[PDB]
Amino acid sequence: AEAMALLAEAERKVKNSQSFFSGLFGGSSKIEEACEIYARAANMFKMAKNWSAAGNAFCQAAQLHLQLQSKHDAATCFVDAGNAFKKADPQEAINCLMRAIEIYTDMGRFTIAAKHHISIAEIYETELVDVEKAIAHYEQSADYYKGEESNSSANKCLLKVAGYAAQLEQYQKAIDIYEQVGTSAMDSPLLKYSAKDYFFKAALCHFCIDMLNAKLAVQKYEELFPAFSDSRECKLMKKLLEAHEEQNVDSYTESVKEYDSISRLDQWLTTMLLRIKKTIQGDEED
Amino acid sequence: AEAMALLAEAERKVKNSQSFFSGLFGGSSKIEEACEIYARAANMFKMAKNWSAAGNAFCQAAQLHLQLQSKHDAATCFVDAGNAFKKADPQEAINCLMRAIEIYTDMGRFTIAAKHHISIAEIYETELVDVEKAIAHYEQSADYYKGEESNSSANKCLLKVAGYAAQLEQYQKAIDIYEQVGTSAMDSPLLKYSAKDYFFKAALCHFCIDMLNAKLAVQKYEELFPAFSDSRECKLMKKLLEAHEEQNVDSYTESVKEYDSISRLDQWLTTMLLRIKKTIQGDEED
Amino acid sequence: ENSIRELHDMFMDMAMLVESQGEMIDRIEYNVEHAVDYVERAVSDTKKAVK
Amino acid sequence: LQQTQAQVDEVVDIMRVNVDKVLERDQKLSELDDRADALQAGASQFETSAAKLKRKYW
């Protein structure tokens, strides 16, 4: 219960012994008791809905637990310190997880480093928006997930790179990413149906390109075009290529006049719609 | 061959001794042997179809482990004791599920705490009808599931809150729930075809809320009104709440069946529909 | 259209059901490596408790 | 139209085969939780037991 007395009785109990207090063995029993109690204390603040004070209570517990010698669960206390300000409003969970991930990889490990590097990336994408750094976090983290054949996040965090990167700034990465996912997507008997929208994303990114480079993917890809769900990928394209190439808008726009009913359009698709018609503006708008 | 002998034989041995029976050591190996006898006893009580002394046997088996070194497998035995009297009719299990909460909540294990904190409300509503405490535990547990950001566990709690805020008739809080959860869902393809279900669930929660918030929450949630389950929400709602503004129940009751012709109604909706139909009727007299 | 509506009922059931299951998969995502984060980390000290 | 009626009603029954699946889906989604929840404590407490062990036999 004590929000303060566990602290006050442990702060007078944390001290290095070169004195009459030294004696025979260390005070590692004392700081072990203290850090277990700090863990309970950061629990009682989080139970009391104090995720800032609780999160800082995790921060002392999480930093002081390394002082005996415990890098094992000090990483867990770092994640708990991160989860508190991740749940609470502000930042500084970013530092709890950057203290976490380096120490976790310093154990001789790979996975959870990436599994919270994505957490920092989610914060720096959604919340503490630093997408030019979060996308690097997805990138290096997906490099770790690639080097462990955890193909899930290996494809996923790359998709998070490319879906925002293409629209904002990186163009050859768009098709290079959606082809790297697309080949091994065609490989597995589990994956080759997810490849349809993956090559849709490879195609409909136009990179200031007026061409049928999407049709280069058509006469590349294993569509099996009697599968009509790729006609919402490329017959869409077989209209709009020549709509954009004949600088025409009442066929290009008509494609989504009919395609909005047969497919709900999210923000990224309509932003790419607006992207290719900014290329149409640059073809038409004087 | 039953464990009623095992309980008394370990109860001879459970003494807190001050004699040569301790000597210098206690009964540590002896009391682990004893708690193993209680473990075996409490298992074969459930094996013997007892269901009433069995969960008591788990209670006591854990009870003689609580004060030793570790409440932890004793806490799991309390979880098992909560799984003991739950199938049975007695209420002893809920108390053991409290004991598990103030071990796992007390220790930092909010995850498993939230795993059975929901089952407590499942018993306070389904079995042991105390539904305002059931709802207070769905809400509290959803606060915990949002503590670790496990969202849809909390949303599955919030339907039992909010869906049972209809018959508890706090419509003002029913519409306070589906907004922040469903406007968070249009970015998710995971639930977007479901999200408009929730803004039928937001929309039809009337205490006769005749503001254009119902005409605007359908718009902030950007929603193609020619969506074909929003045809089953939006223009449905237009006929349902224009006829109320016509003060004319007959074409209302014909068109609610016209909705039944194209999407059959279920319990929570149908009950709220006859509810709001009472409001429409009691408004059309005067 | 009614027959396709019947299968459409079974399919909105299907897809939103497996959707809802995806949250139990989220609790797996907890209990798949946090389970490792306890276990492998504990055996990093029991295997080294021989030291 | 009736050719398509027969085809589509076969596909009603393909969805009924998905209904034959979905109980086998959901029960297994249940029992895998019914193991993972119970696995969590046995996974959790073993590092604590390791700490209890290794303070002595240096």
Tell me whether residues B107 and A260 touch, CB distance under 8 A. no
In 3D space, the residue among B222, B253, B220 whose CA is nearest the CA of residue B239 turns out to be B253
- Most C CBs within 10 Å, among D10, D28, D45, D54, to test the C interface: D54
Using the Cα atoms of residue A179, residue A184, residue A186 and residue A190 in order, give the sign of their dihedral.
negative
Give me the resolution in angstroms, 1 decimal: 4.4
Q: Which two tokens stand for residue A67?
A: 């002082």
Chain D, 23-42: which have a CB under 8 Å from a chain B CB? 37-38, 40-41
C44 touches chain A (CB under 8 A): yes
In this complex, which of A72, A75, A111 lies closest to C45 when CB atoms are compared?
A72
Tell me whether residues C30 and B148 touch, CB distance under 8 A. yes
Long-range Cβ contacts of A271-279 (<8 Å, 24+ apart) = A271/A167, A272/A166, A272/A167, A272/A204, A272/A205, A275/A167, A275/A206, A276/A204, A276/A206, A276/A240, A276/A244, A276/A252, A277/A249, A277/A252, A277/A253, A279/A206, A279/A208, A279/A210, A279/A244
Query: In whole angstroms, what is the distance from residue A211 CA to residue A241 CA?
Result: 7
Distance between first and last Cα of chain D: 83
DSSP H/E element including A24: none
Q: Residues B231-243, buried b or exposed e (16+ Cβ, 10 A)?
A: ebbbebbbbbbeb
Contact B7, B41 (CB under 8 A): yes
B264 touches chain C (CB under 8 A): yes
Which residue shows structure tokens 């205490």? Answer: B207
Query: In whole angstroms, what is the distance from residue B162 CA to residue B174 CA?
Result: 5
Q: Residues D5-44, buried b or exposed e (16+ Cβ, 10 A)?
A: eeeeeeeeeebeebeeebeeeeeebeeeeeebbeebbebb
